[PDB]
mmCIF file of C-alpha atoms in Angstrom:
data_model
loop_
_atom_site.group_PDB
_atom_site.id
_atom_site.type_symbol
_atom_site.label_atom_id
_atom_site.label_comp_id
_atom_site.label_asym_id
_atom_site.label_seq_id
_atom_site.Cartn_x
_atom_site.Cartn_y
_atom_site.Cartn_z
ATOM 1 C CA UNK S 4 112.810 73.767 103.051
ATOM 2 C CA UNK S 5 111.673 71.397 100.317
ATOM 3 C CA UNK S 6 114.812 69.692 99.022
ATOM 4 C CA UNK S 7 113.176 68.631 95.746
ATOM 5 C CA UNK S 8 113.583 70.315 92.367
ATOM 6 C CA UNK S 9 111.506 73.454 91.815
ATOM 7 C CA UNK S 10 111.375 72.699 88.076
ATOM 8 C CA UNK S 11 109.487 69.467 88.925
ATOM 9 C CA UNK S 12 106.519 71.293 90.389
ATOM 10 C CA UNK S 13 106.791 74.718 88.759
ATOM 11 C CA UNK S 14 107.515 76.040 85.307
ATOM 12 C CA UNK S 15 109.676 79.111 85.618
ATOM 13 C CA UNK S 16 109.135 81.813 83.029
ATOM 14 C CA UNK S 17 109.998 85.433 82.205
ATOM 15 C CA UNK S 18 112.327 87.276 84.580
ATOM 16 C CA UNK S 19 110.519 89.978 86.575
ATOM 17 C CA UNK S 20 113.506 91.715 88.117
ATOM 18 C CA UNK S 21 116.969 91.394 89.656
ATOM 19 C CA UNK S 22 118.781 92.382 92.815
ATOM 20 C CA UNK S 23 122.342 92.230 94.107
ATOM 21 C CA UNK S 24 121.442 88.995 95.831
ATOM 22 C CA UNK S 25 118.300 87.748 94.076
ATOM 23 C CA UNK S 26 116.503 87.277 90.797
ATOM 24 C CA UNK S 27 112.736 86.828 90.787
ATOM 25 C CA UNK S 28 111.103 84.938 87.935
ATOM 26 C CA UNK S 29 107.436 84.350 87.147
ATOM 27 C CA UNK S 30 106.481 80.680 87.555
ATOM 28 C CA UNK S 31 103.438 78.465 87.038
ATOM 29 C CA UNK S 32 102.573 75.752 89.558
ATOM 30 C CA UNK S 33 101.974 72.582 87.515
ATOM 31 C CA UNK S 34 99.184 70.978 89.561
ATOM 32 C CA UNK S 35 97.061 74.131 89.869
ATOM 33 C CA UNK S 36 98.123 76.286 86.965
ATOM 34 C CA UNK S 37 98.408 79.227 89.342
ATOM 35 C CA UNK S 38 100.995 81.926 88.694
ATOM 36 C CA UNK S 39 103.523 82.870 91.389
ATOM 37 C CA UNK S 40 106.635 85.024 91.839
ATOM 38 C CA UNK S 41 109.627 82.785 92.477
ATOM 39 C CA UNK S 42 112.497 84.653 94.105
ATOM 40 C CA UNK S 43 115.874 83.002 93.599
ATOM 41 C CA UNK S 44 118.350 83.882 96.355
ATOM 42 C CA UNK S 45 121.928 82.702 95.796
ATOM 43 C CA UNK S 46 123.496 81.192 98.900
ATOM 44 C CA UNK S 47 126.673 82.431 100.549
ATOM 45 C CA UNK S 48 129.411 79.830 100.169
ATOM 46 C CA UNK S 49 132.031 81.101 102.632
ATOM 47 C CA UNK S 50 131.767 83.197 105.779
ATOM 48 C CA UNK S 51 134.434 85.477 104.341
ATOM 49 C CA UNK S 52 132.615 85.723 101.018
ATOM 50 C CA UNK S 53 130.948 89.027 100.131
ATOM 51 C CA UNK S 54 128.771 87.377 97.492
ATOM 52 C CA UNK S 55 125.356 85.828 98.090
ATOM 53 C CA UNK S 56 123.219 85.686 101.228
ATOM 54 C CA UNK S 57 124.112 83.752 104.385
ATOM 55 C CA UNK S 58 121.701 80.948 105.166
ATOM 56 C CA UNK S 59 121.061 82.743 108.441
ATOM 57 C CA UNK S 60 119.894 85.871 106.647
ATOM 58 C CA UNK S 61 117.791 83.594 104.471
ATOM 59 C CA UNK S 62 116.461 81.850 107.568
ATOM 60 C CA UNK S 63 115.475 85.242 109.006
ATOM 61 C CA UNK S 64 113.633 86.364 105.862
ATOM 62 C CA UNK S 65 111.764 83.060 105.634
ATOM 63 C CA UNK S 66 110.605 82.948 109.248
ATOM 64 C CA UNK S 67 109.291 86.530 109.050
ATOM 65 C CA UNK S 68 107.419 85.761 105.842
ATOM 66 C CA UNK S 69 106.074 82.558 107.306
ATOM 67 C CA UNK S 70 104.721 84.423 110.341
ATOM 68 C CA UNK S 71 103.034 87.399 108.657
ATOM 69 C CA UNK S 72 99.510 87.233 107.177
ATOM 70 C CA UNK S 73 97.904 90.495 106.228
ATOM 71 C CA UNK S 74 96.130 91.888 103.150
ATOM 72 C CA UNK S 75 98.844 94.512 102.776
ATOM 73 C CA UNK S 76 101.815 92.131 102.885
ATOM 74 C CA UNK S 77 103.016 89.600 100.276
ATOM 75 C CA UNK S 78 102.474 86.006 101.290
ATOM 76 C CA UNK S 79 104.924 83.132 101.011
ATOM 77 C CA UNK S 80 103.630 79.986 99.269
ATOM 78 C CA UNK S 81 106.606 77.577 99.364
ATOM 79 C CA UNK S 82 110.356 77.411 99.919
ATOM 80 C CA UNK S 83 112.728 75.299 97.836
ATOM 81 C CA UNK S 84 116.486 74.854 98.153
ATOM 82 C CA UNK S 85 119.124 73.305 95.902
ATOM 83 C CA UNK S 86 122.923 73.144 95.950
ATOM 84 C CA UNK S 87 123.306 76.800 94.984
ATOM 85 C CA UNK S 88 120.021 78.601 95.640
ATOM 86 C CA UNK S 89 117.122 78.988 98.075
ATOM 87 C CA UNK S 90 113.926 79.642 96.111
ATOM 88 C CA UNK S 91 110.983 81.417 97.752
ATOM 89 C CA UNK S 92 107.673 80.893 95.948
ATOM 90 C CA UNK S 93 105.967 84.224 96.600
ATOM 91 C CA UNK S 94 102.538 85.641 95.898
ATOM 92 C CA UNK S 95 102.488 87.222 92.437
ATOM 93 C CA UNK S 96 101.414 90.862 92.060
ATOM 94 C CA UNK S 97 99.961 92.387 88.862
ATOM 95 C CA UNK S 98 99.195 96.034 89.586
ATOM 96 C CA UNK S 99 102.796 97.174 89.242
ATOM 97 C CA UNK S 100 104.321 99.932 91.363
ATOM 98 C CA UNK S 101 101.997 102.162 93.350
ATOM 99 C CA UNK S 102 103.816 105.305 92.269
ATOM 100 C CA UNK S 103 103.611 104.208 88.637
ATOM 101 C CA UNK S 104 99.815 103.860 89.011
ATOM 102 C CA UNK S 105 99.341 107.265 90.644
ATOM 103 C CA UNK S 106 101.742 108.865 88.169
ATOM 104 C CA UNK S 107 99.416 107.932 85.310
ATOM 105 C CA UNK S 108 96.303 109.631 86.616
ATOM 106 C CA UNK S 109 95.537 113.358 86.362
ATOM 107 C CA UNK S 110 95.670 115.433 89.562
ATOM 108 C CA UNK S 111 95.509 113.279 92.693
ATOM 109 C CA UNK S 112 93.527 114.863 95.516
ATOM 110 C CA UNK S 113 95.501 115.099 98.725
ATOM 111 C CA UNK S 114 92.777 112.882 100.153
ATOM 112 C CA UNK S 115 92.786 110.412 97.267
ATOM 113 C CA UNK S 116 96.426 109.749 98.151
ATOM 114 C CA UNK S 117 95.866 109.442 101.887
ATOM 115 C CA UNK S 118 93.673 106.452 101.089
ATOM 116 C CA UNK S 119 96.734 104.701 99.680
ATOM 117 C CA UNK S 120 99.023 105.934 102.448
ATOM 118 C CA UNK S 121 96.431 104.605 104.869
ATOM 119 C CA UNK S 122 96.909 101.130 103.396
ATOM 120 C CA UNK S 123 100.669 101.325 103.815
ATOM 121 C CA UNK S 124 100.306 102.498 107.415
ATOM 122 C CA UNK S 125 98.146 99.444 108.120
ATOM 123 C CA UNK S 126 100.621 96.916 106.780
ATOM 124 C CA UNK S 127 103.367 98.589 108.741
ATOM 125 C CA UNK S 128 101.045 98.737 111.770
ATOM 126 C CA UNK S 129 100.434 95.004 111.472
ATOM 127 C CA UNK S 130 104.157 94.280 111.109
ATOM 128 C CA UNK S 131 105.099 96.542 114.008
ATOM 129 C CA UNK S 132 102.486 94.909 116.237
ATOM 130 C CA UNK S 133 104.359 91.639 115.716
ATOM 131 C CA UNK S 134 107.466 93.683 116.526
ATOM 132 C CA UNK S 135 108.790 93.347 113.003
ATOM 133 C CA UNK S 136 110.822 96.238 111.565
ATOM 134 C CA UNK S 137 110.684 96.140 107.763
ATOM 135 C CA UNK S 138 113.885 98.142 107.356
ATOM 136 C CA UNK S 139 113.424 98.449 103.616
ATOM 137 C CA UNK S 140 110.322 100.563 103.204
ATOM 138 C CA UNK S 141 110.475 102.282 99.844
ATOM 139 C CA UNK S 142 108.340 102.959 96.738
ATOM 140 C CA UNK S 143 109.922 100.079 94.784
ATOM 141 C CA UNK S 144 108.682 97.697 97.473
ATOM 142 C CA UNK S 145 105.108 98.979 97.336
ATOM 143 C CA UNK S 146 103.034 97.491 94.511
ATOM 144 C CA UNK S 147 99.350 96.865 93.756
ATOM 145 C CA UNK S 148 97.606 93.505 93.838
ATOM 146 C CA UNK S 149 95.387 94.488 90.880
ATOM 147 C CA UNK S 150 95.015 97.910 89.256
ATOM 148 C CA UNK S 151 91.686 97.255 87.540
ATOM 149 C CA UNK S 152 89.444 97.564 90.576
ATOM 150 C CA UNK S 153 87.479 100.138 92.587
ATOM 151 C CA UNK S 154 89.931 100.347 95.472
ATOM 152 C CA UNK S 155 93.273 98.735 94.511
ATOM 153 C CA UNK S 156 95.196 97.180 97.412
ATOM 154 C CA UNK S 157 98.863 97.911 97.996
ATOM 155 C CA UNK S 158 101.333 95.175 98.926
ATOM 156 C CA UNK S 159 104.697 95.410 100.654
ATOM 157 C CA UNK S 160 106.504 92.855 98.516
ATOM 158 C CA UNK S 161 110.050 92.501 99.796
ATOM 159 C CA UNK S 162 111.241 91.304 103.195
ATOM 160 C CA UNK S 163 115.002 90.892 102.834
ATOM 161 C CA UNK S 164 116.009 93.427 105.477
ATOM 162 C CA UNK S 165 113.047 92.552 107.741
ATOM 163 C CA UNK S 166 113.976 92.043 111.402
ATOM 164 C CA UNK S 167 112.092 90.788 114.458
ATOM 165 C CA UNK S 168 112.959 92.998 117.405
ATOM 166 C CA UNK S 169 114.090 90.707 120.227
ATOM 167 C CA UNK S 170 114.564 91.929 123.798
ATOM 168 C CA UNK S 171 118.273 92.102 124.605
ATOM 169 C CA UNK S 172 120.934 92.326 121.903
ATOM 170 C CA UNK S 173 120.291 94.493 118.827
ATOM 171 C CA UNK S 174 121.488 94.958 115.228
ATOM 172 C CA UNK S 175 123.174 98.029 113.734
ATOM 173 C CA UNK S 176 124.041 97.681 110.025
ATOM 174 C CA UNK S 177 121.222 96.214 107.901
ATOM 175 C CA UNK S 178 120.358 99.248 105.791
ATOM 176 C CA UNK S 179 118.958 99.727 102.313
ATOM 177 C CA UNK S 180 118.544 102.538 99.817
ATOM 178 C CA UNK S 181 120.170 105.796 101.053
ATOM 179 C CA UNK S 182 117.373 107.923 99.653
ATOM 180 C CA UNK S 183 114.985 106.277 102.128
ATOM 181 C CA UNK S 184 117.051 105.171 105.144
ATOM 182 C CA UNK S 185 116.929 106.918 108.505
ATOM 183 C CA UNK S 186 119.711 108.871 110.214
ATOM 184 C CA UNK S 187 120.076 106.147 112.873
ATOM 185 C CA UNK S 188 121.098 103.919 110.012
ATOM 186 C CA UNK S 189 123.587 106.261 108.341
ATOM 187 C CA UNK S 190 125.376 106.859 111.648
ATOM 188 C CA UNK S 191 125.246 103.145 112.431
ATOM 189 C CA UNK S 192 123.294 103.633 115.649
ATOM 190 C CA UNK S 193 120.788 101.464 117.550
ATOM 191 C CA UNK S 194 117.906 100.572 115.271
ATOM 192 C CA UNK S 195 114.253 99.944 116.006
ATOM 193 C CA UNK S 196 110.763 100.486 114.662
ATOM 194 C CA UNK S 197 111.593 104.192 114.281
ATOM 195 C CA UNK S 198 113.521 103.633 111.043
ATOM 196 C CA UNK S 199 110.400 102.373 109.292
ATOM 197 C CA UNK S 200 108.508 105.489 110.388
ATOM 198 C CA UNK S 201 111.192 107.751 108.962
ATOM 199 C CA UNK S 202 110.836 105.801 105.703
ATOM 200 C CA UNK S 203 107.099 106.382 105.764
ATOM 201 C CA UNK S 204 107.726 110.093 106.179
ATOM 202 C CA UNK S 205 109.829 110.067 103.029
ATOM 203 C CA UNK S 206 107.229 108.070 101.107
ATOM 204 C CA UNK S 207 104.431 110.490 101.980
ATOM 205 C CA UNK S 208 106.597 113.507 101.081
ATOM 206 C CA UNK S 209 107.329 112.103 97.639
ATOM 207 C CA UNK S 210 103.731 110.827 97.442
ATOM 208 C CA UNK S 211 102.352 114.379 97.702
ATOM 209 C CA UNK S 212 105.041 116.429 95.880
ATOM 210 C CA UNK S 213 106.746 114.075 93.450
ATOM 211 C CA UNK S 214 110.158 115.077 94.779
ATOM 212 C CA UNK S 215 112.561 113.300 97.135
ATOM 213 C CA UNK S 216 113.385 115.201 100.359
ATOM 214 C CA UNK S 217 117.027 114.073 100.597
ATOM 215 C CA UNK S 218 117.936 112.733 97.142
ATOM 216 C CA UNK S 219 121.370 114.083 96.295
ATOM 217 C CA UNK S 220 123.149 113.822 92.951
ATOM 218 C CA UNK S 221 125.306 111.108 94.530
ATOM 219 C CA UNK S 222 124.937 108.542 97.307
ATOM 220 C CA UNK S 223 127.234 110.671 99.473
ATOM 221 C CA UNK S 224 125.183 113.850 99.098
ATOM 222 C CA UNK S 225 121.985 112.011 99.998
ATOM 223 C CA UNK S 226 123.378 110.364 103.113
ATOM 224 C CA UNK S 227 124.704 113.808 103.954
ATOM 225 C CA UNK S 228 121.262 115.388 103.633
ATOM 226 C CA UNK S 229 119.619 112.548 105.544
ATOM 227 C CA UNK S 230 122.212 112.806 108.295
ATOM 228 C CA UNK S 231 121.590 116.546 108.455
ATOM 229 C CA UNK S 232 117.816 116.166 108.077
ATOM 230 C CA UNK S 233 117.906 119.246 105.842
ATOM 231 C CA UNK S 234 114.650 118.695 103.937
ATOM 232 C CA UNK S 235 112.311 121.603 103.272
ATOM 233 C CA UNK S 236 108.857 122.272 101.837
ATOM 234 C CA UNK S 237 109.738 124.411 98.835
ATOM 235 C CA UNK S 238 106.626 126.333 97.774
ATOM 236 C CA UNK S 239 107.198 125.096 94.206
ATOM 237 C CA UNK S 240 105.920 121.628 95.205
ATOM 238 C CA UNK S 241 104.206 121.995 98.582
ATOM 239 C CA UNK S 242 101.974 124.955 97.686
ATOM 240 C CA UNK S 243 98.835 122.822 97.410
ATOM 241 C CA UNK S 244 99.589 120.761 100.505
ATOM 242 C CA UNK S 245 97.544 121.188 103.682
ATOM 243 C CA UNK S 246 99.145 122.275 106.934
ATOM 244 C CA UNK S 247 98.215 118.933 108.484
ATOM 245 C CA UNK S 248 100.023 117.009 105.733
ATOM 246 C CA UNK S 249 103.285 118.874 106.320
ATOM 247 C CA UNK S 250 102.866 118.446 110.084
ATOM 248 C CA UNK S 251 102.399 114.731 109.532
ATOM 249 C CA UNK S 252 105.669 114.609 107.585
ATOM 250 C CA UNK S 253 107.508 116.813 110.122
ATOM 251 C CA UNK S 254 106.601 114.549 113.026
ATOM 252 C CA UNK S 255 108.059 111.601 111.096
ATOM 253 C CA UNK S 256 111.253 113.084 109.690
ATOM 254 C CA UNK S 257 113.015 113.849 112.958
ATOM 255 C CA UNK S 258 116.571 112.883 113.871
ATOM 256 C CA UNK S 259 115.887 111.758 117.447
ATOM 257 C CA UNK S 260 114.078 108.386 117.059
ATOM 258 C CA UNK S 261 112.452 108.718 120.493
ATOM 259 C CA UNK S 262 110.790 111.956 119.420
ATOM 260 C CA UNK S 263 109.708 110.474 116.084
ATOM 261 C CA UNK S 264 106.050 109.433 115.729
ATOM 262 C CA UNK S 265 105.226 105.741 116.030
ATOM 263 C CA UNK S 266 102.927 103.730 113.771
ATOM 264 C CA UNK S 267 100.100 104.200 116.253
ATOM 265 C CA UNK S 268 100.612 107.967 116.651
ATOM 266 C CA UNK S 269 100.662 108.282 112.851
ATOM 267 C CA UNK S 270 97.267 106.559 112.603
ATOM 268 C CA UNK S 271 95.896 108.787 115.355
ATOM 269 C CA UNK S 272 97.346 111.848 113.615
ATOM 270 C CA UNK S 273 94.626 114.320 112.567
ATOM 271 C CA UNK S 274 95.820 114.173 108.971
ATOM 272 C CA UNK S 275 94.769 110.505 108.979
ATOM 273 C CA UNK S 276 92.162 110.749 111.750
#
């Protein structure tokens, strides 16, 4: 990573958002005048510390980002590091959240939505081809490059929990928002590409109905619902949803990961064609 001072080449600006471990600010590259999204990740000081992110976890997120290159995935521009932080100069998005964009339009044809879901599936497809499990697929991580265009492109913007599946030993923890994680995760079981697919199933469900399939009033209720895979298509929301759509969701939200559709099967699915 570049050991120089970010402030020497970029002019940080307004804060765009915060996370338990990071804070992304909008910056302007001095020599080009181009805008970027600088993500500040505070380093872990001690192995016993519960604060910050271990340089290994940072290493992992940087390598992944450095490897990927797809229209539906954020791109990494530069990486700076100082005494306390590791700054990732990331591509800057302007369209906002996908779900904020859709939730501003009138009715959204079941097909008009599939066009967006198709984009997501691609990005995931790309990632999975390189054997990369995103592990943090959720609305908040799905924005739009530009919202003032004929066919706005979606971008998977975060890669913190992203893991490269290596033959041999595996990981077990690494889980994100309860509302979107898969049962394998909750029960701390062997993880794979299946988790991402479960996530996709949840996205599509919310995408079409506007309701979460496992969102409890409290983190514990949710995890409980997820663990029990007790979702349902209540006629109050899924009354104007095709049979194929529900089938598509059913094949994704299944407890046994081996029986759960894969990114390829989902693209071959008749609801996507």
